[PDB]
Design an enzyme around this catalytic site. Structure first.
Site, short mmCIF file in Angstrom:
data_model
loop_
_atom_site.label_atom_id
_atom_site.label_comp_id
_atom_site.label_asym_id
_atom_site.label_seq_id
_atom_site.Cartn_x
_atom_site.Cartn_y
_atom_site.Cartn_z
N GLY A 46 3.50 -26.02 13.48
CA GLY A 46 4.55 -26.85 12.90
C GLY A 46 5.51 -26.08 12.03
O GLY A 46 6.71 -26.27 12.09
N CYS A 47 4.96 -25.20 11.20
CA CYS A 47 5.78 -24.44 10.27
C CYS A 47 6.62 -23.39 10.99
O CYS A 47 7.75 -23.08 10.58
CB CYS A 47 4.89 -23.81 9.21
SG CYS A 47 3.93 -25.10 8.32
N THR A 48 6.11 -22.88 12.11
CA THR A 48 6.88 -21.94 12.90
C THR A 48 8.03 -22.66 13.60
O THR A 48 9.16 -22.19 13.61
CB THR A 48 6.02 -21.24 13.95
OG1 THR A 48 4.97 -20.54 13.29
CG2 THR A 48 6.86 -20.24 14.77
N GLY A 51 10.70 -23.41 11.04
CA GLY A 51 11.44 -22.21 10.66
C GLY A 51 12.40 -21.79 11.76
O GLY A 51 13.56 -21.44 11.50
#
Ligand code: NA
Length: 157
Positions: A46-48, A51
């Site tokens: 999710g964080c990738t 970003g």
């Protein structure tokens, strides 16, 4: 009247450790729009995705003179590795002590595992050129989020 969140005054002078080894402060960003997006963990799906989504939109943010900061409590080294692997062209804040996280009240609790468990809730904030938090997104769903943030920026700017 326009702020949706009031930060402790000290927040704006907190030294924020960045990917790449430098520091910034929120006050140092006076004069342009700032997107601050909090995410729970470097190098997770999710964080990738989040970003990379912001990264793909960077020229659109540039058009508005806006800057992006991603924030988690991962180390600078982790941030460097993450940013390098993904090719991020904006800084990641290593908020290791969660000072920025607490200021934005993104450390949230959940009753789970028979315990009271705290964690970074995925959240994003628009800050005006005068440091006012004019929009907030909490409990963020990643899909379409950076698009929504850009649209909101364009609406506000
Ligand atoms: Na600003």
């Amino acid at each position: 009247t326009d702020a949706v969140l009031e930060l402790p005054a000290a927040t704006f002078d907190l030294p924020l450790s960045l990917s790449g080894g430098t520091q910034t402060t929120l006050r140092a960003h006076a004069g342009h729009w700032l997107v601050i997006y909090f995410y729970p963990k470097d190098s997770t799906p999710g964080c990738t995705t989040e970003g990379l989504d912001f990264n793909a939109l960077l020229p659109e943010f540039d058009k508005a003179g806006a800057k992006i900061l991603g924030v988690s409590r991962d180390s600078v080294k982790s941030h460097d590795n993450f940013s390098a692997k993904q090719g991020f062209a904006f800084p990641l804040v290593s908020d290791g002590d969660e000072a920025l996280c607490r200021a934005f009240d993104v450390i949230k609790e959940k009753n789970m595992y028979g315990k009271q468990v705290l964690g970074i809730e995925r959240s994003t904030f628009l800050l005006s050129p005068e440091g006012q938090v004019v929009q907030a997104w909490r409990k963020v769903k990643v899909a379409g989020h950076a698009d929504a943030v850009l649209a909101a920026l364009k609406a506000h700017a």
